[PDB]
Amino acid sequence: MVIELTPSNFNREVIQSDSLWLVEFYAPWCGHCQRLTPEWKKAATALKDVVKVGAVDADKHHSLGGQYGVQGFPTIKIFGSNKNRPEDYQGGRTGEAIVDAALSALRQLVKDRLG
């Protein structure tokens, strides 16, 4: 349900995708990330087959952590129409708040495609 993202699959899964993606950049040892885990799963399940929801261990994969300016954890990004310019998510860390942000991002995505 939450797609595990790594340097090896990030391009294929996210960058080359026309799906809306939410990506959590986390560290396993981080208490804040640990508390987010169930809420991230909650969002991923609510968004099944609507929005793709992934997670990068940015503690391990510093390459990806460095690329998206991850200085601390969790860092949440929204990958919309321009996959080269993700938006930083600064909303609430509940599944409910994340889902609302995803819906807003979808509205923006489809409206831009329409023109």
Side-chain angles (χ1 to χ4, degrees), residues 2-110 112-115:
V2 177
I3 292 149
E4 196 70 40
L5 295 165
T6 65
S8 65
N9 76 355
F10 203 90
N11 181 245
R12 191 178 70 258
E13 287 281 356
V14 180
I15 310 299
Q16 303 305 315
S17 178
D18 288 320
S19 298
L20 182 73
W21 272 89
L22 314 180
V23 180
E24 179 210 6
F25 294 85
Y26 71 89
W29 48 259
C30 170
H32 299 95
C33 293
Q34 290 163 16
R35 281 172 255 123
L36 178 58
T37 294
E39 297 301 323
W40 201 245
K41 289 175 184 173
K42 183 175 193 161
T45 44
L47 291 166
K48 184 178 191 288
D49 291 316
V50 181
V51 173
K52 293 191 180 181
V53 177
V56 173
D57 180 347
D59 174 76
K60 179 189 280 287
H61 302 121
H62 52 93
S63 60
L64 276 172
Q67 183 176 176
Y68 300 103
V70 182
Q71 294 180 116
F73 316 100
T75 298
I76 302 166
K77 303 286 188 189
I78 303 177
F79 286 82
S81 56
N82 189 345
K83 292 294 191 296
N84 305 305
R85 304 217 76 88
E87 183 191 341
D88 199 53
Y89 175 72
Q90 295 285 329
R93 290 175 184 177
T94 58
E96 291 86 355
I98 294 159
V99 167
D100 280 348
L103 291 176
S104 293
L106 285 177
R107 288 178 190 106
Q108 213 281 334
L109 176 67
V110 302
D112 289 358
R113 285 171 176 180
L114 284 166

Coordinates of all heavy atoms in Angstrom, one line a residue, residues 9 15 21 25 33 35 50-52 55 61 64 68 77 93 95 97 101 111 113, unseen atoms left out:
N9 N 14.5 2.6 -8.1 CA 13.2 2.6 -8.7 C 12.5 4.0 -8.7 O 11.4 4.1 -9.3 CB 12.2 1.6 -8.0 CG 11.8 2.0 -6.6 OD1 12.2 3.0 -6.1 ND2 10.9 1.2 -6.0
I15 N 9.2 9.8 -11.2 CA 9.6 10.8 -12.2 C 8.9 10.6 -13.6 O 8.4 11.6 -14.2 CB 11.1 11.0 -12.4 CG1 11.8 11.2 -11.0 CG2 11.4 12.2 -13.3 CD1 11.3 12.4 -10.2
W21 N 1.8 11.8 -6.8 CA 2.6 11.1 -5.8 C 2.7 11.9 -4.5 O 3.0 13.1 -4.6 CB 4.0 10.7 -6.3 CG 4.1 9.5 -7.1 CD1 3.9 9.3 -8.5 CD2 4.4 8.2 -6.6 NE1 4.1 8.0 -8.8 CE2 4.4 7.3 -7.7 CE3 4.7 7.7 -5.3 CZ2 4.7 5.9 -7.5 CZ3 5.0 6.3 -5.1 CH2 5.0 5.5 -6.2
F25 N 9.9 11.3 3.1 CA 11.3 11.0 3.3 C 11.6 10.9 4.8 O 11.4 11.9 5.6 CB 12.1 12.2 2.7 CG 12.0 12.3 1.2 CD1 11.0 13.0 0.7 CD2 13.0 11.7 0.4 CE1 10.8 13.1 -0.7 CE2 12.9 11.8 -1.0 CZ 11.8 12.5 -1.6
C33 N 8.9 10.2 12.7 CA 8.6 9.3 11.6 C 7.8 8.1 12.1 O 6.9 7.7 11.4 CB 9.9 8.9 10.9 SG 10.7 10.2 10.0
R35 N 5.8 7.9 14.6 CA 4.4 8.3 14.8 C 3.6 8.5 13.6 O 2.4 8.3 13.5 CB 4.4 9.5 15.8 CG 4.6 9.2 17.2 CD 4.7 10.4 18.1 NE 6.1 10.6 18.5 CZ 6.8 11.7 18.3 NH1 6.3 12.7 17.7 NH2 8.1 11.8 18.8
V50 N -6.1 5.9 -6.5 CA -6.4 7.3 -6.8 C -5.1 8.2 -6.8 O -4.9 8.9 -7.8 CB -7.4 7.9 -5.7 CG1 -7.7 9.4 -6.0 CG2 -8.7 7.1 -5.6
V51 N -4.3 8.0 -5.8 CA -3.0 8.7 -5.6 C -2.0 7.7 -5.2 O -2.3 6.8 -4.4 CB -3.1 9.9 -4.6 CG1 -1.8 10.5 -4.3 CG2 -4.1 10.9 -5.0
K52 N -0.8 7.8 -5.7 CA 0.3 6.9 -5.3 C 1.0 7.5 -4.1 O 1.3 8.6 -4.0 CB 1.2 6.6 -6.5 CG 0.5 5.8 -7.6 CD 1.5 5.2 -8.6 CE 0.8 4.4 -9.7 NZ 1.7 3.9 -10.7
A55 N 7.4 6.0 0.2 CA 8.3 6.4 1.3 C 9.7 6.1 0.9 O 10.0 5.0 0.4 CB 7.9 5.7 2.6
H61 N 19.3 6.3 2.1 CA 19.6 6.8 0.8 C 19.8 8.3 0.7 O 18.9 9.1 0.4 CB 18.4 6.4 -0.1 CG 18.1 4.9 -0.1 ND1 16.9 4.3 0.3 CD2 18.9 3.9 -0.5 CE1 17.0 3.0 0.2 NE2 18.2 2.7 -0.3
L64 N 19.1 10.4 -2.5 CA 17.7 10.9 -2.6 C 17.4 12.0 -1.6 O 16.8 13.0 -1.9 CB 16.7 9.8 -2.5 CG 16.4 9.0 -3.8 CD1 15.5 7.8 -3.4 CD2 15.8 9.8 -4.9
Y68 N 16.5 16.2 -2.7 CA 15.2 16.9 -2.4 C 15.4 17.7 -1.0 O 14.4 18.0 -0.3 CB 14.0 15.9 -2.3 CG 13.8 15.3 -3.7 CD1 14.2 14.0 -3.9 CD2 13.3 16.0 -4.7 CE1 14.0 13.4 -5.2 CE2 13.1 15.5 -6.0 CZ 13.4 14.1 -6.2 OH 13.3 13.6 -7.4
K77 N 6.8 15.4 0.5 CA 6.7 16.1 -0.8 C 5.6 15.6 -1.6 O 5.2 14.5 -1.6 CB 8.0 15.9 -1.6 CG 9.3 16.3 -0.9 CD 9.5 17.8 -0.9 CE 10.8 18.2 -0.3 NZ 10.9 19.7 -0.1
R93 N -0.2 16.1 10.2 CA 0.4 14.7 10.0 C -0.6 13.6 10.4 O -0.2 12.5 10.9 CB 1.7 14.6 10.8 CG 2.8 15.4 10.3 CD 4.1 15.3 11.2 NE 5.1 16.2 10.7 CZ 6.3 16.4 11.3 NH1 6.6 15.7 12.5 NH2 7.2 17.2 10.8
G95 N -3.7 11.1 8.6 CA -4.2 10.6 7.4 C -5.3 11.5 6.8 O -5.3 11.7 5.6
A97 N -5.7 14.8 7.2 CA -5.1 16.1 6.7 C -4.4 15.8 5.4 O -4.5 16.6 4.4 CB -4.2 16.7 7.7
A101 N -5.1 17.3 1.6 CA -4.0 17.9 0.8 C -3.9 17.3 -0.6 O -3.7 17.9 -1.6 CB -2.7 17.9 1.5
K111 N -7.1 20.6 -13.3 CA -7.5 21.9 -13.8 C -6.4 22.4 -14.8 O -6.7 23.1 -15.8 CB -7.7 22.9 -12.7
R113 N -4.3 20.5 -16.5 CA -4.4 19.7 -17.7 C -5.5 20.1 -18.7 O -5.3 20.1 -19.9 CB -4.6 18.2 -17.3 CG -3.4 17.5 -16.8 CD -3.8 16.2 -16.2 NE -2.6 15.4 -15.8 CZ -2.7 14.2 -15.3 NH1 -3.8 13.6 -15.1 NH2 -1.6 13.6 -14.9

